[PDB]
Amino acid sequence: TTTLAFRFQGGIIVAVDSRATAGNWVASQTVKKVIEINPFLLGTMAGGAADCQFWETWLGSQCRLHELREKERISVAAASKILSNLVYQYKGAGLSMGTMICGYTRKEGPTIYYVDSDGTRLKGDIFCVGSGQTFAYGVLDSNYKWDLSVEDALYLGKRSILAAAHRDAYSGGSVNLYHVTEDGWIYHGNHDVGELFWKVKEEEGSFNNVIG
Amino acid sequence: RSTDEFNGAQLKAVTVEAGMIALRNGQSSVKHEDFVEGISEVQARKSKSVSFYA
Amino acid sequence: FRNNYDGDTVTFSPTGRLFQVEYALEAIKQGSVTVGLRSNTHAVLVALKRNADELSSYQKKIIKCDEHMGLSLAGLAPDARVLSNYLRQQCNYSSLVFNRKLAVERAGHLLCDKAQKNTQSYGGRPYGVGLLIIGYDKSGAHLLEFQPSGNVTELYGTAIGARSQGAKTYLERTLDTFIKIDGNPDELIKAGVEAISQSLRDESLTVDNLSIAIVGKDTPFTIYDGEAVAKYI
Amino acid sequence: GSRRYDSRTTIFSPEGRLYQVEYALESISHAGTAIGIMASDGIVLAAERKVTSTLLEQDTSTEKLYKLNDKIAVAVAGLTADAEILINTARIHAQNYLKTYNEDIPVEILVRRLSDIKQGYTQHGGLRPFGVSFIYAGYDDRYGYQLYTSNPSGNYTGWKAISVGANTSAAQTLLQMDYKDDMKVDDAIELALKTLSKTTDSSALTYDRLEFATIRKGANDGEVYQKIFKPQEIKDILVKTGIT
Amino acid sequence: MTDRYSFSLTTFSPSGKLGQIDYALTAVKQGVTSLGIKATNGVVIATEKKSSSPLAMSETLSKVSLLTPDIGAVYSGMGPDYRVLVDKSRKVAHTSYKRIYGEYPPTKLLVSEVAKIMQEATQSGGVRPFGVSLLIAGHDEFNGFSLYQVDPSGSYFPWKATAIGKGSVAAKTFLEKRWNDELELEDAIHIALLTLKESVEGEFNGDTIELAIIGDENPDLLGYTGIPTDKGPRFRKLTSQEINDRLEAL
Amino acid sequence: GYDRALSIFSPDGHIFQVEYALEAVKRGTCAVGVKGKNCVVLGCERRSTLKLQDTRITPSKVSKIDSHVVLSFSGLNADSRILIEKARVEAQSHRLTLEDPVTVEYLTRYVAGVQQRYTQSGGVRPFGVSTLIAGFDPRDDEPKLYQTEPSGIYSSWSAQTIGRNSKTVREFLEKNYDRKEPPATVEECVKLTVRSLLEVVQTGAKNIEITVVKPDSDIVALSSEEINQYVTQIEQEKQE
Amino acid sequence: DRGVSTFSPEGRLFQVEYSLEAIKLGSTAIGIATKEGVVLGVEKRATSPLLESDSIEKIVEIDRHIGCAMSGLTADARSMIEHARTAAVTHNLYYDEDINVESLTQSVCDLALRFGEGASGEERLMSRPFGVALLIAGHDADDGYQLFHAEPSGTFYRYNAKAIGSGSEGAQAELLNEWHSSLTLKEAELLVLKILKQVMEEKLDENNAQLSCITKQDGFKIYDNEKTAELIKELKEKEAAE
Amino acid sequence: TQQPIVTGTSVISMKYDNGVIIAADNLGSYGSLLRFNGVERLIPVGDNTVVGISGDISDMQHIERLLKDLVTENAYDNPLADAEEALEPSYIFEYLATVMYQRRSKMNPLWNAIIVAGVQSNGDQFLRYVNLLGVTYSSPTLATGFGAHMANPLLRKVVDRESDIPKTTVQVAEEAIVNAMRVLYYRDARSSRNFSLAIIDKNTGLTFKKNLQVENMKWDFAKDIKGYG
Amino acid sequence: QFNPYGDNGGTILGIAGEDFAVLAGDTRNITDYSINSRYEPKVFDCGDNIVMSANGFAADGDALVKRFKNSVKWYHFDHNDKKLSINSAARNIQHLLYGKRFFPYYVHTIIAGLDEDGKGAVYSFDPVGSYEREQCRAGGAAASLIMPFLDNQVNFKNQYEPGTNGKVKKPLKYLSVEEVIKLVRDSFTSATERHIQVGDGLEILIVTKDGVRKEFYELKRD
């Protein structure tokens, strides 16, 4: 399981996987791990799929009520705290939760909060989740720069996944990319990790020890 | 059969009301139809009307 | 008049009457007129849809409970909404556990108990609504008349709302006619058209205002309006 | 039976002034006088008993001055039965706050919560409201001595002198002419006993119809000491001042 | 099914002072006479206890009841109200008392608990006040013998001498003179019976006259003399013979 | 406890209670708010007439609900105490759950919902309490002055008067303030608030409190010598 | 007392008769709905130049594609609107679908209905049905554009055109003739403003009229100041021919 | 969770053209101790159903109270009893099933296995199974507990499928059940020769033969065996 | 100590056409080595052309199927007699299942029915209650034998377009209802031979716009 989001000069890049294992067999090789809580905010799906779908749908419910009442876009800061308190109270149920709630306002700049089933609220700039969070962390931190184009920030995220994707066993499938502007997330499209792997292998000559 | 729980006095009113109606229509002779209409005029409740709350 | 007892539900007059029920009988006459008739194999409701004005669209008066059962509202309109949601749940429950459809007699009986209860004690209005319950079951066709009091009675035809006497006059003459008609939808509906023209005095039908429904052996609950009812006229 | 009949005390009055609360002030003024005089160095608190019956052992039984704790004493005027419930409620509240925070409760906090209970009764309690006024003589280090009184309304107001019970006006008027801002506790002892005698129809207000207490910081080594004065100690200071 | 009352029936009169408190009190005054003298070595409590019907057993009728083996009590006013109030008072004292102390309640304490309960009746809608006045006579270490009077208003005060009921006015005055600072147990009883005769004349059989003292301690009555440093019952309910005896020494 | 209907509509289509509530407001002594574009200026009369009342420990009407949200009133003095506590818990509940202090707009709706619940329930009498709510919205310096009715309706107002004799005070604000451009400075604006209050107060300098609340949680109280300074100017206008 | 329980001699609920008069005092609201847009135009009440006319609202968003107008007791109608908002969000969760205007209308009447007298099948915490009427408008495919008028009676009627509040009676008389099937959005807008000046006590301005629409394109969208002004200005030019 | 004590085992059944045949042992075994003897537990309700009950006897009594109660409740209100509000094997089956599922959700299920057998008013054959788990099926032939592993296949011969239900006559089915108890006696330690054979017929109603006994047993082969190794 | 939940095996195969949807399942009911029933349909059309099977423990499925059917009646009430969308039906089942997660229902529930454009749709539910749209997902016990076969030949997954080997795959093709019955049957036949649980019979419910079509194919009974 490899999902990440990292802040950069032009916004946030969210890049995720889609392979879901039931048992040991890949029961679904494609799975939406991008939850649109509302049109401006995205949560990553990790751990039990059912825990996450219900609880980020429910957040959206409060988001709609806040947009009507206050007539002001829902703060990033608020939406993460409401999940954190709810998950904490219900902690030790079996609820399997791990989400970076991502949004980009002009009142706080681009922002990321990692939230856990524990009820942790961690502000951050690099966060990554899953079994392959160790590999992706290695590459990412070393080629991290805040001052960076949108185009280079995207292609770093593509590469980051791909490095981690081969070695991590349960990470594979396809890559969903987003570049998050101020006025919400904009989709930057789907690319099969298989197909992506041919292109890099040739261009950069990477994965030259891997015989593809 | 129509009239239920009406005294002698009330019945009497039903028939007097019928003649005012027949006169208003301008018939030579009162119709059965007019007596029925007098029944719901002698009644406390307002005469048959389109729905508006019920 | 007020007088007597009606702020207090428990207390009755010497006679034994409770004023609350009297008002609730009047309430029926103020609202919608609806007539019912039944043959041994079909059960018919004929309801005159009504509105407040011209720009207003017309508004259903038969509210379908189920494929096998229905009711039509004529006294208080908020009251009917309550009872229908309630009755929807009771048919589900009885169908689920006993595997047997909620037969029309019991259904009127469960309903009496609920109304009676609110009038027994302080708290809770009498349900003022008069409902005419049809239903088609294994033992043929039924039509019951739900009094505001909490009394159900099996009838073959009945009329409710103001000036109901006119409709009853017709139905008793053609009581025998109507019952011996069987396997015929057309025939039944045509009689019921005429029954309600007796009631209406200095008042007009319109075909779109006229809303007619049947339920029977071969027919589930269906509502017919417009071109459809133009056939039976 | 019960539906028909009504004894609603929870009508919002048309005068802005609930009628039941009006009558409870009448009832307060039947009960004897209690006087709070706030000085820089203490609160001198003194209340006359309203019984005067000879068979009745008044000596033993304190019925108006009740010590809640070290820094806070209450004088009662009003209905003694209603009053008992509020004494236990006021005692447990100061202890609970002392346990949580390890500081004697500020005076302000305690008085407010008790007033809010009286308020609650007519807010939507359905209850007749307690027909008692209490002068809470209190101390805390931050704010010095603080003096507040309560109303059957559930309203409190601070003061530098207050009177409740009978002869509210007669007592208040004397204290205004005679008390000056700077008189110390010492003066206030002499002052209190003499004004009370002059209001009351008794020729000499005896020591046995008196209750007297002081709360003072002029108790050495930066400490607070209260003492509900015993009936015979009231007697010696009664003789000095020439009432007897 | 609860009464639809949701509010206090008890209202302040428009002149102050609750209607119902006044209403309850009248009963105590109307009811038959009781007197008590507090004494230094005891307490005498005395009441008239007239035959209801000669055929009626006049022994089973009681107006003395126990609260603790040390403290007894007598009332005037409504008879059925008393019985229930006693039962509540046994529980309020005993269980709760044992849990926070594990002894018999001192008299001061016991009397105060009773006062709150009377107030809560009145305050509570659907429940009209208990109109009874009880004299609770008892012993405690720390105050010697004590007599408190508990009014139906939910207020108590201790008295040297008191009386309630019809004859209260006459009795109090008689006693007032006879009361001394030092009193013999024997004299407190003579003086009590003398006044009681004037409340209603005749019927001075000790059967129809109910007399109790909160006399001196007995390990004899305690029913164990194996350690006789344990306090015995302070309270003693006198026999008819004992009363008969007192009439001769008066 | 009580729960029986008192929300029985008149045949003149109004709750009786709500009418009585309006009557009560008036009696409470006046409070005035006029916001500048750089302040909110608050004036009120307090009891201080009585020789032998120590003002330091006599409660002050003007209430901290938050560092940047303040509240004043006209109406029942008993019921306000309850009101103030409710707002204080809500104010803190926002920092706890949604983060950041109450937006002012949000506290105005909270206060209004309390009154509304009292009219939904038949049991609970509405408070007879109107309030002036003033403050600075988070991360911003914009002055807000809000007004309430005891019936559960809220609205924003440029200037306001509630309490005793609103008539004389209203007529003055219609000539002395104009909506097109607010007072330019703190000093110009303090003077208008002061001038307006003294109309129905009559002089004093000792009895009346003026509290200026400026952005970034600045609450500062005017000394009696400063109050009089404004009176000294105004005496000259009245003479000429 | 005269409870919800106890009826009038006719058999009507007390509260239903009283609530008619309550609404009458309320603010005039005019609704003309067409299949080119629902146009809601309302009178904003004003007592001072000192009142700030931006803050107040009488058109209130209940949902992304749902607009509403309120009249009656405003403070009771402020709760009514809060709960309506709740209902809509709760449906959106359950079916992942935008509520039909019609169902929403029923869900609100079910919630006003519930008293204080004390039932045995229902939860009590009020005293009465709200004595407020609302105009619930909105767009969905099935019915196209809709406008509903909910009564305190526990009865909903759909309308082509409905006027409530002070001007209920005189506005309705014109709306019968002038309303048509042919009308579009620009037509409808001008007509509402025209009726509004006759029933407005003072002059018509863009600063005491507030217009909104429900279109399916924008959802619920409140018109800026400028559009409103321009349609007033356009109406003047035609009035001065006379 | 109920600990099962006294047990019933085996209720064996098969369908034919006009109705259902249902048979059970009568015996309340308590492990090795045959504490209770002659325990009838084919229990009739109307002409149109016999409810053969297996599993815990303690629970069996509780289940009987529900059946008792269901006959009274249908009888109430309506006079009808000709067949209209008369019970059907469907109505009775479903009523139990719903209830059983409530107890097994609380992790305290009622511990029995129930075969409801009967004939509808139109006349169709009814044979379904419900158990502690509430696994619901209609199957042509059924046998519960120990009976499942021999009686299921045994009965299955004569009626192997749904289109053998018209083929099999009452005569073949009767023969098949007589053999079936002879087997069940021989090789099951909790099965006596005691049996009650109920014919649920639409045409003739209930012919209930109690206390049939198979009285003749095979042991011929035992005499020949004398070795051991 | 009662077991938390039993099992009743079986296998189901979900395939989305592009105007129709087919849900096929073995009619056998089996637990341990005894065939519980021969024929007891598992797929039931529950209404508004949505067919439902909660394969795994049959007992859990009786409860789920009923509660879902009760909501089908009420979708008309709430939406003013409008068609129950496949998407909307998916969310309703989800809630119940999250509610009975803390006592966890074992199901692989597949609903199939019609979307907005009138197309086939297959949504499949994990036992906790998550669901996702998928083109083809088999369910049950032998889900894992059946599913790659459908992936390879329908989607032409790794079936290289010749000459452009490694790169381009064979062009995707239209599904037709006739072609789909032929695939389903083949997949059931292979499962029959290698997995004891599959066999005897197959009750295929084809779902089209105009209703449900029931057709029955024999499978080896050994």
| HSE-up (13 A, CA, CB side) for residue E204 | 17
The minimal CB distance from D155 to the residues F1, F51, F77 is found for F77
**What are the distances in angstroms from CA C147 to CA C83, C132, G164, I143?**
13, 9, 36, 59
CATH number of the domain at E173, please: 3.60.20.10
**What's the one-letter identity of residue B32?**
H
Instruction: Kindly provide the b/e burial profile for residues A67-85, where b requires at least 16 CB atoms within 10 angstroms of the residue's own CB.
Output: ebebeebbbbbbbbbbbbe
**What's the one-letter identity of residue A43?**
G
Number of domains chain D contains? 1
Instruction: Kindly provide the b/e burial profile for residues F19-40, where b requires at least 16 CB atoms within 10 angstroms of the residue's own CB.
Output: ebbeebbbebbbbbbbbbeebb
Contact F8 G52 (CB under 8 A): no
Maximum Cα interatomic distance, chain B, rounded to a whole number of Å: 39
Chains near D (3 or more Cβ pairs under 8 Å): C, E, F
The minimal CB distance from G159 to the residues C55, C82, C118 is found for C55
Where do we find the tokens 């006679």? Answer: C15
- Copy the structure tokens of residue E33: 């006479």
Residues 6+ apart with CB under 8 A from D24: D78, D129, D131, D152, E12, E16
Give the whole-angstrom CA distance, residue I134 versus residue I120.
11
Task: List the 163-182 stretch of E: residues with Cβ below 8 A of F.
Answer: none
Q: Which residue of I has its CA nearest to C91?
A: I70
Residues 6+ apart with CB under 8 A from F240: none
End-to-end CA distance of chain I: 36
Give the whole-angstrom CA distance, residue H159 versus residue H143.
14
- Copy the structure tokens of residue G131: 């004595």
Domain range list for chain A: 1-212
Give the whole-angstrom CA distance, residue G37 versus residue I203.
51
Q: Which CATH number does H1-229 carry?
A: 3.60.20.10
Could you tell me which of E134, E136, E238 has the C-alpha nearest to residue E189? E238
**What's the one-letter identity of residue E180?**
N
Backbone angles phi, psi at C41, to 5 degrees: -110, 0
Give H104 to chain I, closest Cα distance, Å.
9
- A174-181 and A126-129 strand pairing: unpaired
Q: Which residues of E touch F4 (CB under 8 A)?
A: 6-7
Task: List the 28-47 stretch of F: residues with Cβ below 8 A of D.
Answer: 47
**What are the distances in angstroms from CA H175 to CA D107, H17, H42, H88, H104?**
98, 15, 20, 27, 38
Report the alpha-carbon angle F208-F211-F216, nearest 5: 175
Are F71 and F65 in contact by the 8 Å Cβ rule? The answer is yes
Pick left, alpha or beta for residue C137 (phi over 0 → left; psi -120 to 50 → alpha; otherwise beta).
beta
* F125: DSSP letter: P
Q: State the burial class of residue D134 (Cβ atoms within 10 Å of its Cβ: 0-12, 13-18, 19+).
A: buried
- Copy the structure tokens of residue A66: 């806040």
Whether the CA torsion E81, E87, E92, E93 is positive or negative: it is positive
CATH number of the domain at D63, please: 3.60.20.10
Q: Which residues of C touch D3 (CB under 8 A)?
A: 7-8, 122
Contact B40 C163 (CB under 8 A): yes
3-state secondary structure C142-170: EEEEECCCCCEEECCEEEECCCCHHHHHH
Q: Quickly list H helices, chain B.
A: 8-25, 32-42
E strands along F24-128, which residues? Answer: 31-35, 40-45, 63-66, 69-75
The minimal CB distance from A81 to the residues F98, F105, F109 is found for F98
Q: How many other C-beta atoms can be found within 10 angstroms of the C-beta atom of residue F220?
A: 9
Residues 6+ apart with CB under 8 A from I14: I21, I23, I110, I112, I122, I124, I134, I136, I137, I138, I139
Q: Which residues of G touch A61 (CB under 8 A)?
A: 89-90, 92-93
- Copy the structure tokens of residue C74: 């004529």
Give the whole-angstrom CA distance, residue I192 versus residue I220.
7
Q: Which residues of E touch D30 (CB under 8 A)?
A: 16-17
CATH architecture assigned to G1-242: 4-Layer Sandwich (3.60)
Give C44 to chain D, closest Cα distance, Å.
44
Q: Quickly list H helices, chain C.
A: 19-30, 77-97, 104-120, 165-173, 175-180, 185-199, 227-230
CATH architecture assigned to A1-212: 4-Layer Sandwich (3.60)
Chains near H (3 or more Cβ pairs under 8 Å): C, I
Could you tell me which of G19, G156, G180 has the C-alpha nearest to residue G147? G156
Contact G91 I78 (CB under 8 A): yes
Are A71 and A58 in contact by the 8 Å Cβ rule? The answer is no
Contact D10 F57 (CB under 8 A): no
Give the whole-angstrom CA distance, residue I122 versus residue I136.
7
Give the SS3 label for residue H197.
strand
Q: State the burial class of residue A88 (Cβ atoms within 10 Å of its Cβ: 0-12, 13-18, 19+).
A: middle
- Copy the structure tokens of residue D121: 């009764």
**CB proximity G117 to F under 8 Å:** yes
Q: Is A2 known to be catalytic?
A: no
Which helix H or strand E contains A102, and what residues bound it? Answer: strand A98-105
Maximum Cα interatomic distance, chain E, rounded to a whole number of Å: 64
Which of A65, A66, A68, A70 is the best residue to mutate to test the F interface, defined by the most F CB atoms within 10 Å of its own CB?
Answer: A70
Taking each helix axis from N to C end, the angle separating G74-95 and A49-69, rounded to the nearest 10 degrees, works out to: 150
**DSSP secondary structure letters along A31-45:** ---EEESSSS-EEE-
E strands along H49-124, which residues? Answer: 49-56, 112-119
Chain breaks in chain B (C to N over 2.5 A) after: none
Options 3.60.20.10, 3.40.50.1000, 3.30.565.10, 3.90.25.10; CATH of C3-233: 3.60.20.10
Give the whole-angstrom CA distance, residue A127 versus residue F228.
62
Are H194 and H211 in contact by the 8 Å Cβ rule? The answer is yes
I216 DSSP β-pair partners: I203
Number of domains chain I contains? 1
Pick left, alpha or beta for residue D157 (phi over 0 → left; psi -120 to 50 → alpha; otherwise beta).
beta
Backbone angles phi, psi at A132, to 5 degrees: -100, 25
Q: How many other C-beta atoms can be found within 10 angstroms of the C-beta atom of residue C155?
A: 14
Q: How many other C-beta atoms can be found within 10 angstroms of the C-beta atom of residue C114?
A: 18
Which of I93, I100, I101 is the best residue to mutate to test the A interface, defined by the most A CB atoms within 10 Å of its own CB?
Answer: I101
Which of B43, B49, B53 is the best residue to mutate to test the G interface, defined by the most G CB atoms within 10 Å of its own CB?
Answer: B53
Are E138 and E214 in contact by the 8 Å Cβ rule? The answer is yes
Chains near F (3 or more Cβ pairs under 8 Å): A, D, E, G
Contact F3 E7 (CB under 8 A): no
Question: Alpha carbon I130 to chain centroid distance?
Answer: 15
Residues 6+ apart with CB under 8 A from I140: I9, I10, I11, I12, I25, I55, I56, I108
Q: Which residues of A touch G85 (CB under 8 A)?
A: 65, 68-69
Are C39 and B37 in contact by the 8 Å Cβ rule? The answer is no
**CB proximity E6 to D under 8 Å:** yes
Number of domains chain E contains? 1
- D34-39 and D161-164 strand pairing: antiparallel
Could you tell me which of F135, F171, F153, F125 has the C-alpha nearest to residue F17? F125
Give G69 to chain B, closest Cα distance, Å.
21
Report the alpha-carbon angle D136-D138-D139, nearest 5: 175
Could you tell me which of I85, I115, I112 has the C-alpha nearest to residue I205? I112
Q: Which residues of B touch G10 (CB under 8 A)?
A: 44-46
- A34-36 and D34-39 strand pairing: unpaired
Backbone angles phi, psi at I203, to 5 degrees: -120, 110
| HSE-up (13 A, CA, CB side) for residue C4 | 20
Resolution (Å) of this entry: 7.8
Pick left, alpha or beta for residue C206 (phi over 0 → left; psi -120 to 50 → alpha; otherwise beta).
beta
Q: How many other C-beta atoms can be found within 10 angstroms of the C-beta atom of residue H122?
A: 8
**CB proximity D124 to E under 8 Å:** no
Contact G18 F120 (CB under 8 A): no
Give D19 to chain C, closest Cα distance, Å.
28
**CB proximity G16 to B under 8 Å:** yes
Give the whole-angstrom CA distance, residue F118 versus residue F113.
9
Give H68 to chain C, closest Cα distance, Å.
15
CA dihedral angle for residue A62, residue A68, residue A73, residue A75, rounded to 10 degrees: -30
**DSSP secondary structure letters along chain D:** --SS---------TTSS-HHHHHHHHHHHHSPPEEEEEETTEEEEEEE-S---SSB-TTT---SEEEEETTEEEEEEE-HHHHHHHHHHHHHHHHHHHHHHSSPPPHHHHHHHHHHHHHHIIIII-SPPP-EEEEEEEEETTTEEEEEEE-TTS-EEE-SEEEESS-HHHHHHHHHHH--TT--HHHHHHHHHHHHHHHSS-SS--GGGEEEEEEEEEETTTEEEEEEPPHHHHHHHHHHTT--
Q: Which residue of F has its CA nearest to G2?
A: F8
- Copy the structure tokens of residue H198: 């109920």
Q: Which residues of A touch G62 (CB under 8 A)?
A: 68
- H125-131 and G219-222 strand pairing: unpaired
Q: Which residues of D touch E10 (CB under 8 A)?
A: 7, 128
Strands of D144-150's sheet, edge to edge? D65-69, D72-78, D132-140, D144-150, D156-158
Give the SS3 label for residue B35.
helix
Give the whole-angstrom CA distance, residue F114 versus residue F129.
11
Q: Which residue of C has its CA nearest to G106?
A: C81
Give the whole-angstrom CA distance, residue F38 versus residue F189.
9
D111 is in which domain, residue-wise?
1-244
Give the whole-angstrom CA distance, residue G175 versus residue G191.
9
Contact G11 C2 (CB under 8 A): no
Could you tell me which of C48, C47, C2, C49 has the C-alpha nearest to residue C23? C2
- Copy the structure tokens of residue C95: 């169908």
Q: Which residue of H has its CA nearest to I9?
A: H135
Q: Annotated binding residue at A49?
A: yes
Are I53 and I154 in contact by the 8 Å Cβ rule? The answer is no
Q: Which residue of G has its CA nearest to B47?
A: G10
Contact E3 D85 (CB under 8 A): no
I55 DSSP β-pair partners: I108
Are H198 and H20 in contact by the 8 Å Cβ rule? The answer is no
Question: Alpha carbon A117 to chain centroid distance?
Answer: 16
**What are the distances in angstroms from CA I189 to CA C199, E60, G66?**
70, 97, 54
Domain range list for chain G: 1-242
**What are the distances in angstroms from CA F97 to CA A57, A81, A83, A122, I17?**
19, 6, 10, 16, 48
Give the whole-angstrom CA distance, residue H115 versus residue H54.
8
Whether the CA torsion G181, G187, G191, G192 is positive or negative: it is positive
Residues 6+ apart with CB under 8 A from I116: I85
Q: Which residues of G touch A66 (CB under 8 A)?
A: none
* Chain G interface residues (partner A, CB cutoff 8 A): 61-63, 85-86, 89-90, 92-93
**What's the one-letter identity of residue C141?**
A
**What's the one-letter identity of residue C60?**
K
Domains of chain F in sequence order: 1-240 (3.60.20.10)
Are D87 and D42 in contact by the 8 Å Cβ rule? The answer is no
CATH number of the domain at I107, please: 3.60.20.10
Q: How many residues does chain B have?
A: 54
Could you tell me which of I75, I85, I98, I176 has the C-alpha nearest to residue I133? I85
3-state secondary structure I52-93: EEEEECHHHHHHHHHHHHHHHHHHHHHHCCCCCCHHHHHHHH
E233 is in which domain, residue-wise?
1-249
Which helix H or strand E contains I154, and what residues bound it? Answer: helix I143-154
**What's the one-letter identity of residue F189?**
C
Question: Which positions of H are annotated as active-site residues?
Answer: 1
